[PDB]
Amino acid sequence: NALKSDFDSLRDQIEKAATSAKFNGVSIADGSTTKLTFLANSDGSGFTVNAKTI
Amino acid sequence: SLAGIGLTTTSTFTTAAAAKTMIGTIDTALQTATNKLASLGTSSVGLDTHLTFVG
């Protein structure tokens, strides 16, 4: 039971840590979106960063 | 004016994909505006030269 409680505590810690990794309301670690594209060129071309849900 | 360079007053973008085309629209507008202003400069130089000759 003690080991089970330790496991549960660590899992809840993981969830808390993962859900708070937001900057400006968007994140690449929660799984809310599939990718984020930033500006890469003066003509509108994009730099794509795929989302890595952790 | 806005209609002269193709900008069509009350022209905005409502999504993030409309601005992607507004970039090219404004590029074309700037190019054509610069062409027209170069022509106006040539006309002004011609007026000055002809005034000097007439005097």
Look-up: residue for tokens 């006309």?
Answer: B43
Q: Which amino acid is at A8?
A: D
DSSP 8-state assignment for residue B28:
H
CA angle B50, B51, B53 (to 5 degrees): 65
Chain B nearest CA to A44, separation (Å) = 6
Q: Report chain A residues whose CB lies below 8 A from the CB of B23.
A: 43-44
Question: At a CB cut-off of 8 Å and minimum separation 6, what does B40 contact?
Answer: none
Question: In this complex, do B20 and A44 lie within 8 Å of one another by their Cβ atoms?
Answer: yes
* DSSP per-residue string spanning A12-27: HHHHHHHHT--BTTB-
DSSP helix/strand/coil, A54: coil
Q: Is A45 exposed, middle or buried (0-12, 13-18, 19+ CB in 10 A)?
A: exposed
Q: Is A51 exposed, middle or buried (0-12, 13-18, 19+ CB in 10 A)?
A: middle
Q: Is B19 exposed, middle or buried (0-12, 13-18, 19+ CB in 10 A)?
A: middle
Write phi, then psi, for B34 (nearest 5 degrees).
-65, -40
**What is the number of CB-based contacts under 8 A between chain A and chain B?**
3
Q: Is A18 exposed, middle or buried (0-12, 13-18, 19+ CB in 10 A)?
A: middle
The approach used to solve this structure was: cryo-EM
